[PDB]
Design a protein around this ligand. Structure first.
Ligand SMILES: [Zn+2]
Ligand SMILES: [Zn+2]
Lengths: 116, 116
DNA sequence: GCATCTCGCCT
DNA sequence: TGGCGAGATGC
């Protein structure tokens, strides 16, 4: 029930980041424009090389906010994840900073060879 | 812990179908060649128009056995599901037999028109 | 932007 | 008597 903000170390029980994601970060220590900045599913997946199974099966499975696309209401709603959890999930799916670069570098190697 | 086999209506607690799938059917009532017959994920999906999420996300999420492809060890393992559960998961996702048939007919319309 | 849909290899 | 990648378009 009652929880320790990772950040300020204070107790809290109810946070926007603890309701919507299970992130022990009290709303005072929330950074909705910086560390607590969101990302679309797609950018996430292309910017960190993350299978939907890496998001949704891997434990704990990350959660997201639905939003309406801008003046694009005829299209499907955006799945906004917290960028912070993607960063870490990635780090734990790739195991390193270096391995993400290396694999995307190897990824480009094929993309050019796929079409070459 | 204890359960009622849907089929004979007797109490049981342990079953091959109740351990592997959550199917209240005692191993006496078990038809592993017919009603308790299994199908690979691919045929399941292509025979009954199911998305991976219709299998995995839709509560209750269906489970499966892993098996070794015939002399095809070089490849990815088979996920055998139970055919029954898919026949139902399908029915609920498509609502009716009339709505499976229709939708695969409307499917073939576009497959043709996709190439035309 | 995202969730489908076929495809060339089993990293 | 099979499943996983990965590229280009509705939505
Ligand atoms: Zn705090
Ligand atoms: Zn029974």
């Amino acid at each position: 029930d009652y929880v320790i903000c990772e950040e300020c170390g204070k107790e809290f029980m109810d946070s926007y980041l603890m309701n919507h994601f299970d992130l022990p970060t009290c709303d005072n220590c929330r950074d909705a424009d910086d560390k607590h900045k969101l990302i679309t599913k797609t950018e996430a997946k292309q910017e960190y090389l993350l299978k939907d199974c890496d998001l949704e099966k891997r434990e704990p499975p990350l959660k997201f906010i639905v939003k309406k696309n801008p003046h694009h209401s005829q299209w499907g709603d955006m799945k906004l994840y917290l960028k912070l959890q993607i960063v870490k999930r990635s780090l734990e799916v790739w195991g390193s900073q270096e391995a993400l670069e290396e694999a995307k570098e190897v990824r480009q190697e094929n993309r050019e060879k796929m079409k070459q």
